[PDB]
Design a protein around this ligand. Structure first.
Ligand SMILES: N#Cc1c[nH]c2ncnc(Sc3c(F)cc(F)cc3F)c12
Length: 167
């Protein structure tokens, strides 16, 4: 039993809800919140911009030190950093950005990072400003992630479409 509330169950391990991931993280304080990161951990907009703002820029400060030490992530890769006031940990996962020409096949690799954590609160990877089809992102999620994932979908209109078209 966990503290996530109001989710629709899609599969044995994938759950979904119309919610603002920032407000959902602040309420649940999950072990792991997933950020829709880029390789530079520059959290400017989309989910990353919103998560970073909620930490009062502490996520960005931590991230800049991480990059100065380690260099950029790979597309499809991830790193674990602090969750600050939102979660115990933040798993920064880089899905391919379609508006950058990156191979959508890397989306499966990106979701594989979720399997290193038993339970996660997460957005759909590569959705929103990363330009991929959210219906496709949900399909890859369900077909790749084996651990317990609670998906927050900000757009109520998109959420209803994701539910109604789910196979
Ligand atoms: N900005 C911003 C946000 C603030 N809270 C959020 N909670 C969830 N998602 C997003 S952005 C987004 C989207 F619009 C569509 C999609 F398919 C995947 C996404 F990550 C935000």
């Amino acid at each position: 039993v966990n503290s996530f509330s109001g989710y629709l169950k899609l599969t044995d391990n994938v759950y979904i809800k119309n919610a603002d991931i920032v407000e959902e993280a602040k309420k649940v304080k999950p072990t792991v919140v997933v950020n829709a990161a880029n390789v530079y951990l520059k959290h400017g907009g989309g989910v990353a911009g919103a998560l970073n703002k909620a930490t009062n820029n502490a996520m960005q400060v931590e991230s800049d030190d991480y990059i100065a030490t380690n260099g950029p992530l790979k597309v499809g890769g991830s790193c674990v950093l602090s969750g600050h006031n939102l979660a115990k940990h933040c798993l920064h996962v880089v899905g391919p950005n379609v508006n950058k020409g990156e191979d959508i096949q890397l989306l499966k690799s990106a979701y594989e990072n979720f399997n290193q954590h038993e339970v996660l609160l997460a957005p759909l990877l590569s959705a929103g400003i990363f330009g991929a089809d959210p219906i496709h992102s949900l399909r890859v999620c369900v077909d790749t992630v084996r651990t317990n994932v609670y998906l927050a979908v900000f757009d109520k209109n998109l959420y209803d479409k994701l539910v109604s078209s789910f196979l």
